[PDB]
Design a protein around this ligand. Structure first.
Ligand SMILES: *ON1[C@@H]2CCC[C@H]1CC(=O)C2
Length: 129
């Protein structure tokens, strides 16, 4: 599923991401925008053999099981395919663990490089939330 901007902001908020670990909704929407362009079925293989999955491109080396990432953990205890669903619950649940891991949203390199320090509030402008 390819979400609309405001549409995703609303699902993120419903699933309790808005101001989770102090990161405003606009941070979460910008992250999704540069990670997946809002497409729940986004996959991207990494040079290390790992794969990033879903709306927030969660990585198979730590966070989910895809059966082909030698030496991986599955800290969210979830098949990585569960992160590709139209329903964002699993992704959101896993992101909560990632963002609590100690480095905040810096764990998303594209959030660091493209969202961090920017007017993230523009991402939720116009939305009925
Ligand atoms: O998820 N990462 C963390 C750091 C090493 C590589 C993977 C697997 C792990 O044990 C934790």
């Amino acid at each position: 599923k390819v979400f609309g901007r405001c549409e995703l902001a609303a699902a993120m908020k419903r699933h309790g991401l808005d101001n989770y670990r102090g990161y405003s909704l606009g941070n979460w929407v910008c992250a999704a925008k540069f990670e997946s362009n809002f497409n729940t079925q986004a996959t991207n293989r990494n040079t290390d053999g790992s794969t990033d999955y879903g709306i927030l491109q969660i990585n198979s080396r730590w966070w989910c099981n895809d059966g082909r990432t030698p030496g991986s953990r599955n800290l969210c205890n979830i098949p990585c395919s569960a992160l590709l669903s139209s329903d964002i619950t699993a992704s959101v649940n896993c992101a909560k663990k990632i963002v609590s891991d100690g480095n905040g949203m810096n764990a998303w390199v594209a959030w660091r490089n493209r969202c961090k320090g920017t007017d993230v509030q523009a991402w939720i402008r116009g939305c009925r939330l």
